[PDB]
């Protein structure tokens, strides 16, 4: 029902995946370091209440009738719904407040990749809040109120709602399906593998940027799916594209979805074969992404796809090589990357006196 | 997780309890072949029967011929029905085709212009529509997708709207939801158990002049943007004055409980509840069934939010049009703008497994 906000790490990374996502990048409008630190503290105070299901500040009502409510109200009477709020700091943030020399090496800018069609308006950002919850309105309310609290000091650059499973109907003993119709998540790092998070996800002190020990690095890609094209392809084309069958999700020739894959049995350009760590010198990702359907465009097509999110200990040893190994992926015929951003995710709020980003400021 | 029954005198999705998610879709028809269209109509009903029960359309999502695309796009596999309802309606522009002109109901009136109106003609109008409501958005999407797929070449999607969470209620025994302005929305609506009020204000009758519309209803849909920036810098008193109810409990001004009957003369002359209330409109009553939406940023540093407003009524001329006309002086106007519109006739329900959608019109 509620995920502990405080911790060595921020919640929302290795904690159970919630049903809905509301992702927002902000740009910073102030040049004042003090102003900004002030805001980070206020934001942390508000996260504490939100994640515990209380209104922000003095509340949503019952105040001076001649002042606007501290909290906008639309969450009154809902449960915290496993709300987690994770903040990240984008590369452009380190050009302000004189932090240029504190940018971590691992927060590397992404190359341009074959096929990229990055929309600048839906790319980048000085910082980000990932808001995950089982109730979409709880998620929206958090983002809405944080934007409200930071107004005049930050603005929302771009926004993405996503959804995964519906927990009030689907078993946790069950893998969700992406909008292409294949199980998605079968081979991933799971929050239970302290060993794999420590090795593959968390930033380590001896990695090079001490303020980031306990943090992680986030890569975000808005990936539109060409659905009407995909739906016209034969069942065998689709299975051929991934290296797994559609119904059970098993690696070709195997019979259970969770049978270890035999990579030589898959077509050389199969998605699973190209993404697999054995084809990538061990590179392994924690994927934590959501499907989106934003509507339909001016030509009658479903504007839908996968808001892809990956956490890793180092962007250079995680996303960049795997993404690069996808240059010839058969999936490329059916997807286009149209947004992208990277963020360093600072370590957690240790206690009630800690604040977001304290290790950096 | 239950399934909602698909057959009945009336289509589901109207008086049915309001499900969490919405995916609305307006279609324009791209065939002139009446037989082409009726065959579409019979194929859609058949899919809809499978979809509302939790099954795949046609031969299923996998296991068919390898060389052939699956009948069902597959992303609902292993998911429950989720109380999915599929509701279809016919826009006024449809009767220009197939020689249907004389069958247009009088009650499917075009809406006049309203002050403040600012209607994007792209996200407006429509030959027909499918309203898909479900508690799982994947389920809702999968239905519209597979429906559009089956109709490729006979209909195309003109526009759609996703509703990420409800702001209506047809079940006054469960908690009322709040809209994006923070107030409860749905308190004094029509409930699915008030059979008397449903006949009086929602279902079309044989005597109403168009017989094939018997047992159906008429749908108005308005896309209404909210100036949340403006609203969020208004005082609590200003906000509460605009509606006439308080924000926390939702009670009429001066009363104590959300469901106490509003005493309209204590409300400001231009308070929303006072103007919308049927006693101020000669008894005009609506069935509200709308959803909240947010469609990213606005590119000006703020969230783009609003309400996708849907109302079912026995006759548009005595439902939405008079109540909306009275809202011309509504204090809420300062914070909203209407930016899409469309009306549909929703026909009777599919009586049994040999019936089909529109069978009474064709
Ligand atoms: C629309 C875009 C994508 C779709 C539909 C998709 C789908 C899938 C599917 C069905 C699987 C097999 C089941 C599983 O998740 O383990 C998979 C695995 C995987 N994908 Fe993707 N993927 C997409 C994009 C990406 C991107 C952009 C990357 C990396 C930059 C990526 C990396 C991986 C990895 C590492 C695996 C695990 C393979 C293994 O170790 O067995 N995917 N993906
Ligand atoms: C963003 C747009 C709107 C918002 C936020 C809004 C909000 C509200 C609220 C808070 C209530 C009070 C509780 C309830 O009975 O549900 C209400 C009632 C009502 N509203 Fe609206 N409304 C909007 C637009 C409209 C429109 C366009 C119409 C009709 C054209 C309308 C008609 C009504 C009616 C008939 C009632 C019931 C009055 C009664 O019998 O007490 N509203 N609305």
The full 3-state SS of chain A, as one line of letters, equals CCCCCCCCCCCCCCCCCCCEEEEEEEEECCCCHHHHHHHHHHHHHHHHHHHCCCCCCCCCCCCCCCCCCCCCCCCCCCCCCCCEEEEEECHHHHHCCCCHHHCCCCCCCCCCCCCCCCCHHHCCCCEEEEEEECCHHHHHHHHHHHHHHHECCEEEEEEEEEECCCCCCCCCCCCCECCCCCECCCCCCCCCCHHHHHHHCCCCHHHCCHHHCCCEEEEEEEEEECHHHHHHCCHHHHHHHHCECCCCCCECCCCCCCCCCCHHHCCCCCHHHHHCHHHCCCCCCEECCEEEEEEECCCCCEEEEEEEEEEECCCCCCHHHHHHCCCCCHHHHHEEEEEEEEEEECCCCCCCCCCCCCCCC
Residue B10 token pair: 């009336």
Pairing of the two strands B287-288 and B303-313:
antiparallel
- DSSP conformation class of B35: H
Contact between B88 and B24 under an 8 Å Cβ cutoff? The reply is no
Residues with CB under 6 A from ligand 1: A 178, 180, 182-188, 221, 223, 225, 242, 244, 261, 271-272, 275-277, 285, 306, 308, 319, 322-323, 335
A341 token code pair? 């951003």
d(CA B332, CA B203): 29
CA distance A26 to A156: 4
Phi, psi of B118 (to 5 degrees): -155, 70
Q: Do residues B164 and B24 touch, judged by C-beta distance below 8 A?
A: no
- Nearest CA to B245 out of B271, B280, B276 is that of B271
* Token couple for A118: 């990055």
Angle at Cα B317 formed by Cα B85 and Cα B291, nearest 5°? 35
Helix, strand or coil for residue B105? coil
A253 backbone φψ class: left, alpha, beta (φ>0; ψ -120 to 50):
left
Question: What distance in Å separates residue B209's CA from the closest CA in chain A?
Answer: 36
Q: Tokens 């009502």 sit at which residue? A: A61
Q: Are A227 and A179 in contact (CB under 8 A)?
A: yes
**Cβ pair B62:A247 closer than 8 A:** yes
* B120: its two tokens: 């994007």
Q: How far is the CA of B317 from the centre of ligand 2 (A)?
A: 18
Helices B137-150, B34-53: axis angle to 10 degrees equals 150
CB A180 within 8 A of CB A54: no
Secondary structure (DSSP) of B237-278: HHHHHHHSB-SSS-PBTT-SSTTSPP-GGGS-TT-HHHHHSG
SS (H, E, C) B175-220: CCCECCCCCECCCCCCCCCCHHHHHHHCCCCHHHCCHHHCCCEEEE
Q: How far is A189 from chain B (nearest CA, A)?
A: 23
Dist. CA B215–CA A144, nearest whole Å: 42
Which residues from chain B sit within 8 angstroms of residue A69, using beta carbons? Answer: 182, 236, 239, 247
Distances (CA, A) of A211 to A80, A197, A204, B8: 30, 18, 10, 64
SS3 B133: strand
B133 vs B19: CA distance, rounded Å: 6
Specified resolution (Å): 2.0
For residue B281, the ligand closest to its alpha carbon is 2
Residue B309 among known ligand-binding residues? yes
The nearest alpha carbon in chain A to B146 belongs to: A231
Distance of alpha carbon B191 from alpha carbon B289, whole angstroms: 11
- By C-alpha distance, the chain A residue nearest B72 is A231
Structure tokens belonging to residue A24: 């927002």
- CA dihedral over A96, A101, A106, A109, signed as positive or negative: positive
**Residue B115 burial (CB count, 10 A):** 9
A181–B294 C-beta distance less than 8 A: no
Query: Annotation-wise, does B317 bind a ligand?
Result: no
B329 is in an annotated binding site: no
Q: Which three-class secondary structure string do you get for A142-172?
A: HHHHHHHHHECCEEEEEEEEEECCCCCCCCC
HSE-CB for A162 with a 13 A CA cutoff: 28
d(CA A153, CA A148) in angstroms, rounded, equals 10
Q: Which of B24, B88, B25 is nearest to B344 (CA)?
A: B88
Q: How far apart are CA B24 and CA B162, in angstroms?
A: 6
Distance from CA of B63 to the nearest CA of A (A): 8
Q: Which of A238, A209, A212, A214 is nearest to A226 (CA)?
A: A238
- The distance of Cα A223 from the centroid of its chain, to the nearest Å, equals 13
Residues B103/B361, Cβ–Cβ less than 8 Å: yes
Task: Determine if residue B45 is labeled as part of a ligand binding site.
Answer: no
CA–CA separation, A271 and A261 (whole Å)? 12
Residue in chain A closest to B136 (alpha carbons) equals: A166
B120 CB neighbour count, 10 Å cutoff: 11
Which residues 122-141 of chain A have a CB within 8 Å of chain B? 122, 135-137, 140
Residues with CB under 6 A from ligand 2: B 179, 181, 183, 185-189, 222, 224, 226, 243, 245, 262, 272-273, 276-278, 286, 307, 309, 320, 323-324, 327, 336
Q: How many CB atoms are closer than 10 A to CB A259?
A: 13
Q: Where exactly are the structural domains of chain B?
A: 1-362
Contact B297 A236 (CB under 8 A): no
Residue A105's alpha-carbon distances to A210, A358, B106, B192, in angstroms, are 12, 19, 70, 61
Tokens 């308005």 found at = B222
Sign, CA dihedral A100-A102-A105-A106, equals negative
- Taking only Cα atoms into account, the Rg of chain B, rounded to an integer number of angstroms, comes to 21
Residue B179 tokens read as 């809209």
Instruction: State how far the Cα of A296 lies from the Cα of B25, in Å rounded to an integer.
Output: 9
In 3D space, the residue among A327, A269, A288 whose CA is nearest the CA of residue A112 turns out to be A327
Sign of CA dihedral B67, B73, B75, B80: negative
Query: What would the two tokens of residue B45 be?
Result: 């009903």
- Measured between CB atoms, does B68 come within 8 Å of chain A? yes
Q: What does the alpha-carbon distance between residue A345 and residue B56 come to, in Å, rounded to a whole number?
A: 42
3-state secondary structure of B101: helix
Place of tokens 């082409």: B36
Neighbours of A281 (CB within 10 A): 9
- What gap in Å lies between CA B129 and CA B357, rounded to an integer? 12
CA A166 / ligand 2 centre spacing (Å): 30
DSSP B135: S
Exposed, middle or buried: residue A246 (CB in 10 Å: 0-12, 13-18, 19+)? Answer: buried
What is the C-alpha to C-alpha distance for residues B274 and B264, in angstroms, rounded to an integer? Answer: 6
What single DSSP character describes residue B351? -
3-state SS assignment for residue B118:
coil
What is the C-alpha to C-alpha distance for residues A65 and A138, in angstroms, rounded to an integer? 25
CB of B282 closer than 8 Å to CB of B325? no
The experimental technique behind this entry is X-ray
Residue to test with chain B: of A134, A225, A300, A305, most B Cβ within 10 A: A300
């Amino acid at each position: 029902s509620a995920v502990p906000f405080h911790g060595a790490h921020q919640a929302g990374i290795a904690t159970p995946v919630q049903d809905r996502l509301h992702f927002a990048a902000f740009d910073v409008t102030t040049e004042d370091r003090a102003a900004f630190v002030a805001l980070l503290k206020e934001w942390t105070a508000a996260a504490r209440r939100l994640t515990a299901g209380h209104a922000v500040g003095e509340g949503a009502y019952g105040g001076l009738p001649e002042a606007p409510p501290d909290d906008t109200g639309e969450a009154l009477g809902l449960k915290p719904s496993r709300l987690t709020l994770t903040i990240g700091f984008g590369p452009s943030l380190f050009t302000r407040f004189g932090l240029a020399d504190l940018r971590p090496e691992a927060l590397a800018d992404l190359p341009k990749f074959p096929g990229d069609n990055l929309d600048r308006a839906r790319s980048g950002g000085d910082l980000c809040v990932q808001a995950c919850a089982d109730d979409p309105q709880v998620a929206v309310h958090a983002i809405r109120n944080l934007a409200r609290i930071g107004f005049g000091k930050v603005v929302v650059r771009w926004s993405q709602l996503g959804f995964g499973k519906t927990s009030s109907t689907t078993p946790d003993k069950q893998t969700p399906r992406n909008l292409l119709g294949f199980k998605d998540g079968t081979r991933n790092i799971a929050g239970t593998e302290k060993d794999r998070l420590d090795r593959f996800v968390w930033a380590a002190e001896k990695d090079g940027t001490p303020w980031m020990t306990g943090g992680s690095y986030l890569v975000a890609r808005r990936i539109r799916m060409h659905i009407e094209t995909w739906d016209r392809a034969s069942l065998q084309e689709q299975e051929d594209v991934f290296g797994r069958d559609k119904g059970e999700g098993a690696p070709v020739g195997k019979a259970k979805e969770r049978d270890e894959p035999f990579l030589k049995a898959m077509k050389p350009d199969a998605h699973v074969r190209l993404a697999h760590p054995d084809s990538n010198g061990g590179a392994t990702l924690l994927r934590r992404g959501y499907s989106f359907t934003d509507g339909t465009d001016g030509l009658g097509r479903l504007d839908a796809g996968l808001f892809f999110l990956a956490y890793q200990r180092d962007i250079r040893t995680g996303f960049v090589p795997v993404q690069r190994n996808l240059a010839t992926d058969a999936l490329n015929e059916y997807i286009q990357h149209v947004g992208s951003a990277v963020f360093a995710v600072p370590p957690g709020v240790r206690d009630a006196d800690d604040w977001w980003g304290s290790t950096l400021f």
